[PDB]
Amino acid sequence: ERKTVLVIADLGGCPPHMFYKSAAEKYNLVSFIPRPFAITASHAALIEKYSVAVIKDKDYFKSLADFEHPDSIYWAHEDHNKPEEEVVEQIVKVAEMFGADAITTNNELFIAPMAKACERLGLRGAGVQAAENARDKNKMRDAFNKAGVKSIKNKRVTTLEDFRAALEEIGTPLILKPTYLASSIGVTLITDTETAEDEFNRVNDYLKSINVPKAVTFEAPFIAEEFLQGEYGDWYQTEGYSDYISIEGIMADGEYFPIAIHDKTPQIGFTETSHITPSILDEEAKKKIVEAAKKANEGLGLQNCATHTEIKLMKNREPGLIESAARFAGWNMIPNIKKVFGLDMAQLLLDVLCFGKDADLPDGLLDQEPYYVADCHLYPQHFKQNGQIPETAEDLVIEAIDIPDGLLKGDTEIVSFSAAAPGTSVDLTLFEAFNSIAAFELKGSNSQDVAESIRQIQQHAKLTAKYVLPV
Ligand SMILES: Nc1ncnc2c1ncn2[C@@H]1O[C@H](COP(=O)(O)OP(=O)(O)O)[C@@H](O)[C@H]1O
Ligand SMILES: C[C@H](N)[P@](=O)(C[C@@H](Cc1ccccc1)C(=O)O)OP(=O)(O)O
Numbered sequence: 001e002r003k004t005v006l007v008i009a010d011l012g013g014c015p016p017h018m019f020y021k022s023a024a025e026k027y028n029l030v031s032f033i034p035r036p037f038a039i040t041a042s043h044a045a046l047i048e049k050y051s052v053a054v055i056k057d058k059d060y061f062k063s064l065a066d067f068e069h070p071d072s073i074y075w076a077h078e079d080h081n082k083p084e085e086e087v088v089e090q091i092v093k094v095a096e097m098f099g100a101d102a103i104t105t106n107n108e109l110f111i112a113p114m115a116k117a118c119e120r121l122g123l124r125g126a127g128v129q130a131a132e133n134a135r136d137k138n139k140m141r142d143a144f145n146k147a148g149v150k151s152i153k154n155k156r157v158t159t160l161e162d163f164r165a166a167l168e169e170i171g172t173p174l175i176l177k178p179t180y181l182a183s184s185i186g187v188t189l190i191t192d193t194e195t196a197e198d199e200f201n202r203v204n205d206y207l208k209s210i211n212v213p214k215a216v217t218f219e220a221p222f223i224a225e226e227f228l229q230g231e232y233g234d235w236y237q238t239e240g241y242s243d244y245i246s247i248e249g250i251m252a253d254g255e256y257f258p259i260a261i262h263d264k265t266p267q268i269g270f271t272e273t274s275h276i277t278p279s280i281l282d283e284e285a286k287k288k289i290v291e292a293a294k295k296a297n298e299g300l301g302l303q304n305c306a307t308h309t310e311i312k313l314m315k316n317r318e319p320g321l322i323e324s325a326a327r328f329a330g331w332n333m334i335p336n337i338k339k340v341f342g343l344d345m346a347q348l349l350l351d352v353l354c355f356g357k358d359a360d361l362p363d364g365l366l367d368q369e370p371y372y373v374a375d376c377h378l379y380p381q382h383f384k385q386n387g388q389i390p391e392t393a394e395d396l397v398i399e400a401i402d403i404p405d406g407l408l409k410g411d412t413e414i415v416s417f418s419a420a421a422p423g424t425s426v427d428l429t430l431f432e433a434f435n436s437i438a439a440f441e442l443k444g445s446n447s448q449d450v451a452e453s454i455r456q457i458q459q460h461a462k463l464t465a466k467y468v469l470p471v
């Protein structure tokens with residue numbers, strides 16, 4: 001007989017078009033929406049369809065205009081001002097209110113509060129400290145160093161003085177990033193000491209302007225850290241991928257169960273472009289990645305959750321840990337694992353949260369892909385790179401994006417292609433990762449052909465649009 005799962009419904013992780021239908025199959029869902037403005041019209045519709053109960057924070061609603069849902073949201077550009085403890089209390093109350101058996105979220109930002117609520121209720125969860133470890137990058141990097149994985153120098157940074165010391169201890173090149181966000185927001189590579197101060201002041205000012213719930217707490221706002229150098233040629237046998245991978249897994253009563261590795265196409269700066277399900281890497285490479293992710297996620301002390309772990313492919317086949325999340329990967333990675341292997345990770349997670357290791361957990365990475373699926377985005381920068389939009393262009397207005405015939409290698413096909421709606425206005429001022437202007441899916445028998453098709457589409461896609469220039 002059916003169990004009840006509290007989902008903290010917000011942006012990120014497993015996309016609504018899969019999560020709610022997958023969850024509802026065997027579970028009664030209660031949906032808590034702490035941030036009603038973060039819910040798209042289509043997300044809203046899926047929430048009500050598949051939920052036995054829906055609870056929104058009523059304090060957001062002040063007039064009729066508050067009840068409108070946007071068509072598209074990438075990052076929620078509005079304030080949520082409740083302290084962590086108050087958010088925790090809200091989760092526990094909604095859970096008691098409805099007799100919840102489990103709590104899950106797809107949202108990075110509410111991971112730590114969710115953990116506190118779970119343990120306060122005797123339910124399965126990330127573990128209080130482990131979730132903070134998977135959310136505060138200073139704490140994260142520390143746990144990584146103490147675990148058996150590749151260690152790097154790192155330091156907490158709050159003030160300019162902290163940054164200058166960090167630049168003295170650790171050298172050029174160094175990674176400076178906010179400790180508590182996602183989506184590569186604020187993540188900066190400093191390569192020369194002569195303009196390093198200016199860059200820190202720039203990113204410090206920039207950070208103050210990012211909308212984030214007050215419930216996200218942190219030891220220090222920045223981490224300064226060694227840059228993890230990749231060696232493509234030590235890992236991949238063909239071109240088309242990149243220096244890094246993610247690996248998706250599940251933690252179950254403290255044990256790491258790897259599911260799938262994703263290959264990647266080169267990012268734009270630190271903005272991601274494509275994910276390929278599954279990885280083409282050999283069995284020896286995969287084993288190294290799995291070992292790193294096992295040590296890292298167990299090193300965090302994570303108890304019960306989905307896992308999204310990013311790894312830099314370094315010299316001598318050494319896995320370098322970028323970051324790990326106690327939640328599902330974003331974009332279509334989780335649905336694409338289901339298309340390729342037939343495994344529904346959303347159902348698997350809830351099964352683990354309700355039954356522990358009694359769930360149908362795979363031992364080792366899924367294998368015997370019948371083919372490869374690519375999740376790909378296009379950005380204004382692609383159209384600057386290919387000469388269609390000049391560098392100083394302003395306020396792009398997109399009519400259409402079309403893919404010319406003849407760009408696909410081998411048997412690769414376009415399964416779906418979706419451009420921004422005719423007439424949408426894109427602010428070229430925004431951080432690139434916020435500005436996807438098309439999404440497409442590729443399928444093929446041959447990974448290299450898939451990746452090469454991606455590069456071709458990125459190069460040759462035709463934009464129909466208008467932009468502004470100053471005289
Ligand atoms: N120490 C590092 N060495 C090399 N690259 C890094 C490092 N930290 C971050 N990056 C790059 O920045 C991207 C985003 O940073 P990340 O640590 O994943 O934070 P988030 O994705 O949560 O913003 C990574 O995918 C990686 O490409
Ligand atoms: C694909 C990326 N690796 P991601 O999964 C992107 C986050 C972004 C996100 C968007 C809105 C709210 C929370 C997270 C997400 O979609 O959940 O994690 P990270 O690598 O950015 O940390």
Ligand SMILES: [Mg+2]
Binds near residue numbers: 108181182183323
């Ligand atoms: Mg993150």
Ligand SMILES: [Mg+2]
Binds near residue numbers: 183184310323
């Ligand atoms: Mg990341």
